[PDB]
Amino acid sequence: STKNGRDSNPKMLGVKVYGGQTVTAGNIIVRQRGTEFHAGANVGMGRDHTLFATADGVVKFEVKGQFGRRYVKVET
Amino acid sequence: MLQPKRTKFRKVHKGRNTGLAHRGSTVSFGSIAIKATERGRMTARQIEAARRTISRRIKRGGKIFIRVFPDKPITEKPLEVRMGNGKGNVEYWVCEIKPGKILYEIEGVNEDLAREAFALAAAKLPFKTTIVTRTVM
Amino acid sequence: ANFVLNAQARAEDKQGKGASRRLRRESLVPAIIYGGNAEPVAVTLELRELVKALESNVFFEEVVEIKVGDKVENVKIQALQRHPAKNTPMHADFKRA
Amino acid sequence: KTIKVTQTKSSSHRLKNHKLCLQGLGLRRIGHTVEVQDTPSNRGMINKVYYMVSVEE
Amino acid sequence: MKVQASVKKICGSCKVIRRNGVIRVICSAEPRHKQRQG
Amino acid sequence: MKTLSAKPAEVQHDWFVVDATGKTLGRLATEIARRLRGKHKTSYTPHVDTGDYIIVINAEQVQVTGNKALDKKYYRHTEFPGGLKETNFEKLVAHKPEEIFERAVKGMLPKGPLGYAMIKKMKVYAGSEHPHAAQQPQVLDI
RNA sequence: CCCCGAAAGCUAUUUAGGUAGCGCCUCGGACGAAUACCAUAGGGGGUAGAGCACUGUUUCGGCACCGAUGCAAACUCCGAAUACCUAUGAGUACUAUCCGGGAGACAGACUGCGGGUGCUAACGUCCGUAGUCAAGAGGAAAACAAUCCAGACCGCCAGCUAAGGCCCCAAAAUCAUAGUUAAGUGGGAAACGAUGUGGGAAGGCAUAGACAGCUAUAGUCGAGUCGGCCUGCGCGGAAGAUGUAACGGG
Ligand SMILES: [Zn+2]
């Protein structure tokens, strides 16, 4: 009899809206366990590190700053 | 009987052996070497048998460099056991061999004696081999 | 001046993976020549001549002449690629000297 | 400005997108010949199914 | 006569010959070296 | 019904004589089978025998290539247990030369009543003489 | 008689050969380009490969460190092709979507590719992905659901082709031009063994005379000879039970 045989239910993480798409305020952009992406302009961060839009516009990804963090912002 | 002193995991996936040995195909330590020309597996017992044959032939007048290490565990079922009920138990260790991989090098003996020793060792191996010498590039 | 390799121009239609495999099936060897004050040039060598030259030990420390048409280049061998299992030379690098 | 494309092999067992390329070019059966505009959009469909069409250029 | 898959010269008085498509070894000095491939 | 079948009552069988000296067995047998079946006539019909009579003389002079004279085997089975009998071309051509031709041509003719009827038109003789002078066979060099 | 035409999946179940919601089929209504294929443009990745910068593991030196050298599903300094999302656009196509009436199905199979398990066993087992069968006839495979070619509305004693073939069974070349094989190899198999034969790139010795034989290095004679490397096609290795029986036959 094996001592293995367990696993957890899937969580369905990942990028939900890609660069160049238009969003409405409140749209979820990234589901992530940790801050793989950071919130830029017009983007808010939830209690579970979810990134969402706070304004209408076009999503844009970039690499910026002195640490080389990945940012996602919304351009109005 | 070479085998890792400790391992992070006990049992590993079967995998697939494909491609050529671009790394580890150049004579580095000695002057003459034996290398494989087809792919396969090399067990620890095979490695030990070939090393013993080479050392006995050359009478330990030089140095033998072994460049293969069996770090892959292989499992088998306990026999008369049905399919299922978990993976089998580790039985022996192998090294994956790709065409071009150098197995042994010899330093400090004549080419004739080295080639005789390599011909003696090649009969102990499950794949085809060839003899190479050091070159500038 | 002691070592002379007769070569042919290797054009864009003869560059690439499939073209290189066809060249090696023709028993030819691709090579590149680069070095100060000039753009790289791609050439095609003969496997026979390359093996003959590599058999000699002074070939690796002497200025050699690669001759294509009337153009002549004075170079030294910089790198070589061999087949992992067959030891056949497959590509050559030449630095202008 | 226009090219003629003829279907030379069956499409019954091909991939879904390959069948859709044939349909989007307008070919319907083996031996059928159509005349289409010579544009990159049409050339893409032709190139994707090169192996079962013949182009009179 | 030895019948083996591998037949080879033993000494300098052995000879490798072919008769009717069969490879054999015959020795002038030692009859025990006589071989036939099979 | 515009395509007509040959009528058996209107078929004409012609008599030919063939010398087997030095010929290759199979390459002679194919032509013999063709002419026995009537494939050479414009009135050829699959269900009608339209062929010709073939007389083979000097049967024991037929040749085979390579090493087949010693290696080619002829088998038969008496239906008793263990009753497999074997011979070869060298012995059979010396003993019963007509059986070699019979086997070679039977293997190339259709297997049925019409094939049995077709093969009855081949006469094989070891010597240089045949008893069919009354039918006035014509020399056929195939 | 005519038209369309599945599924053998997901989730739950004293449930597992039952059933229910969803996925897939059909019919009616509404609504038309909102849909798809392809091109161009924008976007995230951590797989194949590779690497040793972390985590482990490995060999040889020098003094845990330094220099060389390997490995990894649960390692990553790196990192594709494809696939996926969005916008614009030509051409082609009855596409997409919404609301209702009726279902069936929830035992799958083989093959190719990426894998787990198994012995890189099984016409084995479990997933992903595509094709076929299932529910599909015809032709080629000797016969042979799942392979190759190809999708049968009906009739014709008309023609052109696909896969595959053209000496006879049996339709079509005993066709043409160059080679190779002698094993019936073709028409079953390995490590390994051998002066079998064809081709190619080098090397050694030699008509101030080479190799073999032969007489006591010299000498008779009178030209090639020797030993390896790469490569095409062959040879041995090769023993079973009803009867040739491992080209379908000749
Ligand atoms: Zn002997």
Swiss-Prot record, chain A:
It comes from the Bacteria. GO terms for biological process: translation. Residues 1-12 are annotated as: Disordered. SUPFAM superfamilies: Ribosomal L27 protein-like (SSF110324). InterPro entries: Ribosomal_bL27, Ribosomal_bL27_CS. Keywords: Ribonucleoprotein, Ribosomal protein. GO terms for cellular component: cytosolic large ribosomal subunit. Gene3D superfamilies: 2.40.50.100. One of its GO terms (molecular function) is structural constituent of ribosome. The keyword Cell membrane does not apply. Belongs to the bacterial ribosomal protein bL27 family. This is Large ribosomal subunit protein bL27. It comes from Acinetobacter baumannii (strain AB0057). The gene is rpmA.
Curated annotation (Swiss-Prot), chain B:
It comes from the Bacteria. GO terms for molecular function: rRNA binding; structural constituent of ribosome; tRNA binding. Keywords: Ribonucleoprotein, Ribosomal protein, RNA-binding, rRNA-binding, tRNA-binding. GO terms for biological process: translation. GO terms for cellular component: cytosolic large ribosomal subunit. It holds the Pfam family Ribosomal_L16. Gene3D superfamilies: Ribosomal protein L10e/L16. SUPFAM superfamilies: Ribosomal protein L16p/L10e (SSF54686). Belongs to the universal ribosomal protein uL16 family. Binds 23S rRNA and is also seen to make contacts with the A and possibly P site tRNAs. NCBIfam families: rplP_bact. Part of the 50S ribosomal subunit. This is Large ribosomal subunit protein uL16. It comes from Acinetobacter baumannii (strain AB0057).
Swiss-Prot record, chain C:
Pfam families: Ribosomal_L25p. Keywords: Ribonucleoprotein, Ribosomal protein, RNA-binding, rRNA-binding. One of its GO terms (molecular function) is structural constituent of ribosome. Residues 1-22 are annotated as: Disordered. One of its GO terms (biological process) is translation. The keyword RNA-binding applies. InterPro entries: Rbsml_bL25/Gln-tRNA_synth_N (IPR020056), Ribosomal_bL25/Gln-tRNA_synth (IPR011035), Ribosomal_bL25_short (IPR020055), Ribosomal_L25_dom (IPR029751), Ribosomal_uL5_bac-type (IPR020930). It comes from the Bacteria. The keyword RNA-binding applies. GO terms for cellular component: cytosolic large ribosomal subunit. Part of the 50S ribosomal subunit; part of the 5S rRNA/L5/L18/L25 subcomplex. Contacts the 5S rRNA. Binds to the 5S rRNA independently of L5 and L18. This is one of the proteins that binds to the 5S RNA in the ribosome where it forms part of the central protuberance. Belongs to the bacterial ribosomal protein bL25 family. This is Large ribosomal subunit protein bL25. The lineage of its organism: Bacteria, Pseudomonadati, Pseudomonadota, Gammaproteobacteria, Moraxellales. The gene is rplY.
UniProtKB/Swiss-Prot annotation, chain E:
It comes from the Bacteria. Keywords: Ribonucleoprotein, Ribosomal protein. GO terms for biological process: translation. Pfam families: Ribosomal_L36 (PF00444). Coiled coil: none annotated. One of its GO terms (cellular component) is cytoplasm. One of its GO terms (molecular function) is structural constituent of ribosome. NCBIfam families: rpmJ_bact. Belongs to the bacterial ribosomal protein bL36 family. This is Large ribosomal subunit protein bL36. It comes from Acinetobacter baumannii (strain AB0057).
